[PDB]
């Protein structure tokens, strides 16, 4: 369902947003 996919996209987006923050930080401190 559209609603299901939307909650799934929002799920991925939420994680994605965090992953990029952590990667940027970890790289900024290490990389």
């Amino acid at each position: 369902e559209v609603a299901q996919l939307e909650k799934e996209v929002a799920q991925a987006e939420a994680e994605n947003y965090q992953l990029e923050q952590e990667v940027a930080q970890l790289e900024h401190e290490c990389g």
């Binding site: 369902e1 559209v2 996919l5 799934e8 996209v9 994680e15 994605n16 990667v23 990389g31």
Partner: protein
């Protein structure tokens, strides 16, 4: 669009999958 959101999910998961590995790789590298 269902088909549209599905590709959104896949695109996100594709980036999420890569980012997740990066975060954990970075946690190993400098965690």
């Amino acid at each position: 669009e269902v088909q549209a959101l599905k590709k959104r999910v896949q695109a996100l998961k594709a980036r999420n999958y890569a980012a997740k590995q990066k975060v954990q790789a970075l946690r190993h590298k400098c965690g």
